[PDB]
Design a protein around this nucleic acid. Structure first.
Ligand SMILES: [Zn+2]
Ligand SMILES: [Zn+2]
Length: 214
DNA sequence: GCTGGCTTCGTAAGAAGCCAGCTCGCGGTCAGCTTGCTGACCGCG
């Protein structure tokens, strides 16, 4: 297949009703909208799809920021299904709400970058290969392994200093700030300040960006 | 790559081709009956 064969996810109307959802185990009815995470098979050239009912796919941990470019078959879905996948992708769970806005939904947290206190002491900073001690603050750049596709986005941990040294190769653009790391809000104020200090991004204050109202 | 369910061909009886589906392993932190060791959730990649 020329092109259109490297995407990590696929969406389409069930070609049959024999596929079983990898999350709830129930069968996926033919013609129903289903999604799958593509995986390379070591037994033969070709990728095996792990299918899930549309809703189950998001309850396992799979995440997509831009469906049009990350999910194969997206452009061939009916318009309403293209909007449903686009909105579901934006919604990152978390019981939120709304009241006054202009565009639709809003994103303010990276899905491939996280910050948290080491849940244990067997992890290892992938920048200096030194072990991270339990309790120590660590950062990570989510990445998928072609050898372990069933895992999906796995965290690649680093010490905050080591992470900043490789910000470019890790894809941490200069416009991103520490407040965008997944898990930032759960850090003590002291820990949050240290991060904002090394990853400032644009600015810490907020004056305006289009209108004039303090 | 293999399985399997079924559509296509056949004078009929049974046979074949083919679209569609298809998967964590390991280590050990922190506990517990078993008397000196064992158990396993859950963190890691
Ligand atoms: Zn399901
Ligand atoms: Zn390090």
């Amino acid at each position: 297949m020329a092109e259109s064969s490297d995407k990590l996810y696929r969406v389409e109307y069930a070609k049959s009703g024999r596929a079983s959802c990898k999350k709830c185990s129930e069968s996926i009815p033919k013609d129903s909208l289903r999604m799958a995470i593509m995986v390379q098979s070591p037994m033969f050239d070709g990728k095996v799809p792990h299918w899930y009912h549309f809703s189950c796919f998001w309850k396992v941990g799979h995440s997509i920021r831009h469906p049009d470019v990350e999910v194969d078959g997206f452009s061939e879905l009916r318009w309403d299904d293209q909007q449903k996948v686009k909105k579901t992708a934006e919604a990152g769970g978390v019981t939120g709400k709304g009241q006054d806005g202009i565009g639709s939904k809003a994103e303010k947290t990276l899905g491939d970058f996280a910050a948290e206190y080491a849940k244990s002491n067997r992890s290892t900073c992938k920048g200096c290969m030194e072990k991270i001690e339990k309790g120590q603050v660590r950062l990570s750049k989510k990445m998928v392994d072609p050898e372990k596709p069933q895992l999906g986005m796995i965290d690649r941990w680093y010490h905050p200093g080591c992470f900043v040294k490789n910000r470019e190769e890790l894809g941490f653009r200069p416009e991103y700030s520490a407040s965008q790391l997944k898990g930032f809000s759960l850090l003590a104020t002291e820990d949050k300040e240290a991060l904002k200090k090394q990853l400032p991004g644009v600015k810490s204050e907020g004056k305006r960006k289009g209108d004039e109202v303090d």
